[PDB]
From a paper:
NOD1 and NOD2 (Nucleotide-binding oligomerization domain-containing proteins 1 and 2) are cytosolic receptors of the innate immune system, which respond to intracellular fragments of the bacterial peptidoglycans, D-glutamyl-meso-diaminopimelic acid (iE-DAP) and muramyl dipeptide (MPD), respectively. Upon ligand recognition, NOD receptors oligomerise and recruit an adaptor protein, Receptor Interacting protein kinase 2 (RIP2), through interactions of their respective CARD domains. RIP2 also contains an N-terminal dual-specificity ser/tyr kinase domain (RIP2K), which belongs to the TKL kinase family (Tyrosine kinase-like). RIP2 undergoes auto-phosphorylation and K-63 linked ubiquitination at Lys209, becoming a scaffolding protein for downstream effectors.
Numbering used by the authors:
A (entry chain A): 5 to 173, 188 to 200, 207 to 298
B (entry chain B): 5 to 172, 188 to 200, 202 to 298
């Protein structure tokens, strides 16, 4: 009965474009919206190179996903900018950037308190759980700490639905081994690696330089290192968390939980926080 | 081209219903969503009395408005619960309640800092401005401090679209031209009047027309040009940009609607004031 069209934003409504990130297909700029008087983010194709029709349908697809999948912990899409010269997804601006910045810029963030870390982990879980509970389920398939955005008060917004799929009935460190040996449980594997990354503040497979070596190692059952040096003894519920992580990134996909099951399992741990 | 249906929530997915507010047509309960594992709010019709078909179309209309009008400072609707027994709008839960609670519970909140007050005022303005910039424009027509919800970190969410209209209860927030029934373009400048009263209320932490007991007396007074009191007692000298704010308030609640700004104009005017904050 009830539906809503995604707003179309005229190009002239976007002012003060400044580069935030530039990639292969995806470039992100910050902007002022002239009507709304707020700062926005614009994920757009390169303004210099010609805009191909296959690249055009990709962006409209990603925009449709974001618009359908809106929820407290998913990046809110504000509208689409669809012009002959320009194509861009307009989203809310995230002042604190991506999660990896918080975890790995140790000068800027000397102490990242345990309650915040666990809250971040809980919110990522809640976000992906929502996606998996849509009809049909939406699988993210690109969860990275680089893709978890943080708003003004450090709440999670899941971003980058470029590789996302409807269950129809780049770095490889977050990818389950069955994706490359010569996937329904993909997101939970990534989540386990992210959990490890959040609790350690370390790059997974830091010491391994060749990505093919990581791939062979992972396919043989090697995982990011768990000891006292990587995961310190003072982590709250360290035993549960290690247990959960290791089930989350299990070699056999059947041993890995659903996000519902993962949230059930996490709630004993989160009950002890403020 | 691109559109999204509002999710339909089966009744059994809502657990642990607890009353948050009960009114004439609108009752609000908090709940657990069994799938999503989050606390939600449910704005529903009374579960005891029979659900009339005119009351049913009212709730579906309000839900359609919320779903179309989603934005950073508007209450997010998560879905609709549409059953034979039960009808409810499921929204995000707001832990800090309504704005009036922050302003008027002075034991619970002894000091409410100026930067927070101005941020609240800025966000209300941004919210209503968004509504007015939709096509067609959406006019709220029920702005009260009682209707401005505050999330976990005290950010604004505009709520209660029960009296809202597409362009093309207390009376203290109502412009005098609205008192009596041809209908004109003065119905466009309703929200800005309410905003001016809210601004006064935020800066003073006082009930507008506290000293006037009969609401009809308020109405007569307002129609003759009387407004909430501006002096040192109500609006203290230590308000940042006190002169600008008084000037803005008084233009916002002007007797002639043509003297009142659009929310775009209001945001333009506010940005000199907000530039001096963190």
């Amino acid at each position: 009965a009830i539906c809503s069209a995604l707003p179309t934003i005229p190009y002239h409504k976007l002012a003060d474009l400044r580069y935030l990130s530039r990639g292969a297909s995806g470039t992100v700029s910050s902007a002022r919206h002239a009507d709304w008087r707020v700062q926005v983010a614009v994920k757009h194709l390169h303004i210099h190179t010609p805009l191909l029709d296959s690249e055009r349908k990709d962006v409209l697809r990603e925009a449709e996903i974001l618009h359908k999948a809106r929820f407290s912990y998913i990046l809110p899409i504000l509208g689409i900018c669809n012009e002959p010269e320009f194509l861009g997804i307009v989203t809310e601006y995230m002042p604190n950037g991506s999660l990896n910045e918080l975890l790995h810029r140790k000068t800027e963030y000397p102490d990242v308190a345990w309650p915040l870390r666990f809250r971040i982990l809980h919110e990522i879980a809640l976000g992906v759980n929502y996606l998996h509970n849509m009809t049909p389920p939406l699988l993210h398939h690109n969860l990275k700490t680089q893709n978890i955005l943080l708003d003004n008060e450090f709440h999670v917004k899941i971003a980058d639905f470029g590789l996302s799929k409807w269950r129809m009935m780049g770095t490889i460190i977050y990818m389950p081994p069955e994706n490359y040996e010569p996937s329904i449980k993909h997101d939970i594997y990534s989540y386990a690696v992210i959990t490890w990354e959040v609790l350690s503040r370390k790059q997974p497979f830091e010491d391994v330089t060749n990505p093919l070596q990581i791939m062979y190692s992972v396919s043989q059952g090697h995982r990011p290192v768990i000891n006292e040096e990587s995961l310190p003894y003072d982590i709250p519920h360290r035993a549960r968390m290690i247990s959960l992580i290791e089930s989350g990134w299990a070699q056999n996909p059947d041993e890995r939980p659903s996000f519902l099951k993962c949230l059930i399992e996490l709630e004993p741990v989160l009950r002890t926080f403020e």
